[PDB]
């Protein structure tokens, strides 16, 4: 066993029920992304207050403003920072655990110098 799971007093199952705390699958159609573009996000809001912003969202929930329209209408500071990077470059295919390779040569290698197979750490 292990301690915090075998404990008999301060160990409710709902605090360690990781199966039922599973992450949802997020889905983004084109409507939901022009909302993030025309309006903003919860991190960078660009939406009016009250019912005005409510029906501003509703104008996107239905086909009011399109995705291409929102891209054309988008400023430099929106694209360069929320679509492309701050430097204007596109984002690369992300890596969860980046692996930087190193080549082992000489005496600590598997095969000597002549052979056509190398050693990568």
């Amino acid at each position: 066993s292990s301690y915090p799971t075998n404990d008999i007093a301060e160990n409710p199952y709902w605090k360690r029920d990781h199966r039922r705390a599973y992450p949802q699958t997020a889905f983004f159609d084109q409507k939901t992304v022009t909302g993030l573009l025309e309006l903003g996000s919860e991190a960078t809001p660009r939406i009016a207050d009250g019912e005005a912003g409510t029906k501003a969202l509703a104008n996107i929930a239905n086909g009011g403003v399109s995705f291409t329209q929102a891209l054309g209408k988008s400023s430099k500071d929106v694209i360069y920072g929320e679509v492309l990077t701050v430097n204007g470059l596109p984002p690369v295919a992300p890596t969860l655990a980046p692996k930087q390779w190193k080549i082992i040569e000489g005496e600590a290698a598997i095969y000597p110098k002549g052979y056509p197979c190398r050693t990568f750490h």
């Binding site: 008999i8 409710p12 709902w14």
Partner: protein, 209 residues
Amino acid sequence: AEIELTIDGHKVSIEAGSALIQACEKAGVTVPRYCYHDKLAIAGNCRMCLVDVERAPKPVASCAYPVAPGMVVRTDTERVKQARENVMEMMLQNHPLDCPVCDQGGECDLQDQSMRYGRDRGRFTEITGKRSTEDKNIGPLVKTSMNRCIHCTRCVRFANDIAGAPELGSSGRGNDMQIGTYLEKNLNTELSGNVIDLCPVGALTNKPY
């Protein structure tokens, strides 16, 4: 006339005076139960329907608490989950390890709701052991293994209200309370088999099957 209320953020509407569990069923919200049945009277003894209402300090029974206008219910939060865990702990305190030899296995509400709303392991290890209860003979149709009774009172309510068989009752007091005929009597009615289906445990079972 219908009213309006909120359950887990969802707004739903049912007639006034209705029970909260009915609102949760209309809203598609699943609430546990052992002693509530749509066709039997409301008993509030299992204490498994507990939910959180902003009005009330303590968690209240969905089966019995009336529906009111503007009430806000949560069936999700930590108090409710802990309550369900605690109630199943107590429910399975004295329950017998009869699951292989029990004919309700695979279609038991106790099993499924322990897996869903309860603990993974028990903390009952007392050397004095569990309670025991003797088996009753109520006829050739209903077989009794009454160590498995969880004291829901569905059988009694059915027999006394829907069937007109007042011979079944609740004798004793406390942990030694026993469902049955206080003396050896038969459950004489032409509707007795629905007791087998109403019991969410295998305390009352089909004898030829």
